[PDB]
C-alpha cells in the first residue's frame, strides 16, 4: 500500500490547502495598507567587536541586554560585554567547527555545538576556577545547527539528522525527540513563554513543536527553498523564517499559513539570520549579499539596511529590550546597530 | 566604585587578548584541510616544520550542502577518487561550482572504463606530461583520461581564483600543493597574477 497511500496523503494535503484558503479571504498587505510607514530607519555601528580569528557563524544575546556570546570556527566561544566592548570570557572549544551557541536566560551557562555532534554546555558560575565544560550532550548523528536554553535545566538542540532533541542537562540524556522533519534542521526559536518552539529545516518546511509532549502540532510549507533561520514574533503567535530562495516569509500559529512575503527583485541571495525587534514591527534579516536588510513586518518593505559587514552575515540577534542589534558575519567582527 | 570594576574588566580583556594573540599565532601557522571522497576525524601531520590539520567527517548525513559551508576558509580541499567514477566526477563538479568554495583550491588524488565514457574512444594521451617508468601505454591513456575529465570541469568557470592539483596514488605532494596555493594567494594580493 504505497501508491494509494500517497494519493490519500495528497488528498489530505489538498484538503488542508482548502481549509487554509477558507481563512485567506483577505491578505495581510490589504489590511495593513492603511498603516503609516515607519520610513527610512538609520542605524550606525556603535561598537565593532573584534578578536575572533575565523568566521563567525552564531551569536546569542543575554536577557540583560549586556552580555552576548559568539561562536567562531577557529575554536572559540567568546562572551562579549556590549557596553564597553571588553571581552569577559574566551572559552576554548574542543571542536573547531562550532555551528551554534546559546546563552542561558539566567546567564549561568553557555552552550555550543557543530560538526562534532556534541552540544557542549559550559558553566559560567565558576565556583572554584575558570569556565569548565559542565556537560556534553552526545546523541545526534547530524551536526549541531541551533540550540536555545529554556532554562538552566533543559535545552532544545537541532541537528543535521533531521531530528530535534530536548535534553536534561543534569542527566545529559534526551527527554523527547522531534523526528518529524525530513531535511537538515538549521534553526530553532523558542516562544517567549517557552511552551512551544518552531524549527526550520532543509525540506522547505517549518514545523511547530511542543516541548512537553514532543509532538508536532502544526507544519508550514510556504517556502521554495531550504530554511536557514527562524524566529518567533514577540507576541508568541507568529514567526518569520529565512531561506535561500531570497524571500522572507511570516507565518502565523493560528492562521496555519503564510501571512506576508518579504522579497525584492534585486535580492537573489539567501537569508542566514532573522530576528524581530522589541515591538515586532521591524524584521531584520541577514543576507548573503554582504548586507542586512531591515524589513517592516507589516508593510513588507525595506525600512533600512545594515551594510557595514565585509563578508557573509551568518547570525543576527536583537536585544530582549530592543536597545540594539548585534550583527555577526564571516569577516570575524560583530557590529552593534541601533 | 565603577572605576575599580572597569579596571578589572579591562585587565580581564587584556588577558583575553594576550591568549587570543598566541592562539592566532598557532592558528595561522596551521593549514586546515578538508578530506572527502565524533562526527569528524582529525589527523595532524607536519612537513618542513609547518603543520597541516586535515579534517575528515564521520557521522554526517549525505546532504552535505549545508555543513560544508564551514570549510570555505580552509587552505585546500583534498579530493580522493577510488561506475563510482561518474559519481566522483559530479561530486567534484558540485565542489568546484559551490558558491562559497569558489575561493578554495582543490587537491585531487586519482585512483581506479570505455563503455561508461564514450569520449574515451576519441581521447589521446597528452604530450605535455610523461608517464611513470614501466607503465603500459593503455594504462597511461586511461589514467590521463580520468585526470583530464576532472581537469575539464576544473577549467570551467575557474577564473583563476582557485586551481585543481591532480595527483596519482602523498603527504609531500599535499605540502607542495598547499605551498603553491599560499604563494598564488599572496601573489594575487600583490596583483602579480
Amino acid at each position: 500500500e504505497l501508491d494509494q497511500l500517497r494519493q490519500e496523503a495528497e488528498q489530505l494535503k489538498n484538503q488542508i490547502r482548502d481549509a487554509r484558503k477558507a481563512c485567506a479571504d483577505a491578505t495581510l498587505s490589504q489590511i495593513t495598507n492603511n498603516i503609516d510607514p515607519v520610513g527610512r530607519i538609520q542605524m550606525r555601528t556603535r561598537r565593532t567587536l573584534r578578536g575572533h580569528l575565523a568566521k563567525i557563524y552564531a551569536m546569542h544575546w543575554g536577557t540583560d541586554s549586556r552580555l552576548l556570546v559568539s561562536a567562531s570556527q577557529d575554536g572559540k566561544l567568546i562572551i562579549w560585554d556590549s557596553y564597553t566592548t571588553n571581552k569577559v570570557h574566551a572559552i576554548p572549544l574542543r571542536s573547531s567547527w562550532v555551528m551554534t551557541c546559546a546563552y542561558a536566560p539566567s546567564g549561568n551557562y553557555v552552550a555550543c555545538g557543530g560538526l562534532d555532534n556534541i552540544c557542549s554546555i559550559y558553566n559560567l558560575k565558576t565556583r572554584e576556577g575558570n569556565v569548565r565544560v559542565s556537560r556534553e550532550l552526545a546523541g545526534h548523528t547530524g551536526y549541531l545547527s541551533c540550540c536555545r536554553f529554556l532554562d538552566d535545566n533543559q535545552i532544545v538542540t537541532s541537528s543535521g539528522d533531521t531530528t530535534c532533541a530536548l535534553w536534561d542537562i543534569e542527566t545529559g540524556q534526551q527527554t523527547t525527540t522531534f523526528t518529524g522533519h525530513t531535511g537538515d534542521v538549521m534553526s530553532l526559536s523558542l516562544a517567549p513563554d517557552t511552551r512551544l518552539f518552531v524549527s526550520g529545516a532543509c525540506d522547505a518546511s517549518a514545523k511547530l513543536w511542543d516541548v512537553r509532549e514532543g509532538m508536532c502540532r502544526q507544519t508550514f510549507t510556504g517556502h521554495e527553498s531550504d530554511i536557514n533561520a527562524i524566529c518567533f514574533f514577540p507576541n508568541g503567535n507568529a514567526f518569520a523564517t529565512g531561506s535561500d530562495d531570497a524571500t522572507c516569509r511570516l507565518f502565523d500559529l493560528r492562521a496555519d499559513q503564510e501571512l506576508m512575503t518579504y522579497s525584492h527583485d534585486n535580492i537573489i541571495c539567501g537569508i542566514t539570520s532573522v530576528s524581530f525587534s522589541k515591538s515586532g514591527r521591524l524584521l531584520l534579516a541577514g543576507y548573503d549579499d554582504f548586507n542586512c536588510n531591515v524589513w517592516d513586518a507589516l508593510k513588507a518593505d525595506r525600512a533600512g539596511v545594515l551594510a557595514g559587514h565585509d563578508n557573509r552575515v551568518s547570525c543576527l540577534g536583537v536585544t530582549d529590550d530592543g536597545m540594539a542589534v548585534a550583527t555577526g558575519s564571516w569577516d570575524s567582527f560583530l557590529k552593534i546597530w541601533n | 566604585d565603577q572605576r575599580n570594576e572597569e579596571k578589572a574588566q579591562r585587565e580581564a580583556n587584556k588577558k583575553i587578548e594576550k591568549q587570543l594573540q598566541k592562539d592566532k599565532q598557532v592558528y595561522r601557522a596551521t593549514h586546515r584541510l578538508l578530506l572527502l571522497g565524533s562526527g569528524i576525524f582529525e589527523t595532524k601531520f607536519q612537513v618542513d616544520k609547518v603543520n597541516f590539520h586535515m579534517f575528515d567527517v564521520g557521522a554526517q548525513r549525505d546532504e552535505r550542502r549545508k555543513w560544508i559551508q564551514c570549510f570555505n576558509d580552509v587552505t585546500a580541499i583534498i579530493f580522493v577518487v577510488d561506475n563510482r567514477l561518474q559519481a566522483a566526477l559530479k561530486l567534484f563538479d558540485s565542489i568546484w561550482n559551490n558558491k562559497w568554495l569558489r575561493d578554495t583550491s582543490v587537491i585531487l588524488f586519482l585512483n581506479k572504463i570505455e563503455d561508461y565514457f564514450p569520449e574515451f574512444a576519441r581521447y589521446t594521451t597528452p604530450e605535455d606530461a610523461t608517464p611513470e617508468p614501466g607503465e603500459d601505454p593503455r594504462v597511461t591513456r586511461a589514467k590521463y583520461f580520468i585526470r583530464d575529465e576532472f581537469l575539464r570541469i576544473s577549467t570551467a568557470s575557474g577564473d583563476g581564483r582557485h586551481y585543481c592539483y591532480p595527483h596519482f596514488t602523498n603527504i609531500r605532494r599535499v605540502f607542495n600543493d598547499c605551498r603553491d596555493i599560499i604563494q598564488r594567494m599572496h601573489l594575487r594580493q600583490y596583483e602579480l597574477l
Partner: nanobody
Amino acid sequence: QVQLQESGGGLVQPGGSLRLSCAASGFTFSNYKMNWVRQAPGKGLEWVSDISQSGASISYTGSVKGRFTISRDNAKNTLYLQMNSLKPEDTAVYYCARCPAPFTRDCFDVTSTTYAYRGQGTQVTV
C-alpha cells in the same frame, strides 16, 4: 509547498523511445537548475542529466550521451527527458530533482536519504 510530479513510465521494449515529463509546482521554475536521477534495483541513486536555469548549460552521463536529451519549458513549469535507444540496463526508478538554492551551479541531490526536493519517481522497465 515544493512538489515534483513525474509522469510517464511503465514498460518499454529495448531500443524504443519514452518521454518523461514532471509537473513542477510550489516554486519559480525558471530560476533553479533541475536534473534527473535514477535508482536501479540493487544500487543507489545516480545522476543522469541536468539543464541550466534558461537551458544554456546541458550535460549528460556517458552512459546516456546522445541517447538521452533534456529540455525545460519555463512557460508552464515543466521539465522533459526524452529517452532514445533504451538499453535493458536503463531500467530504474527515474527521479527528478531540483537545485536546493536558486542561481547556484552546484547540486547535492544524489543523496539516498530521501532528498526533499525530489519527486516520488516513476518506474521505468525495459
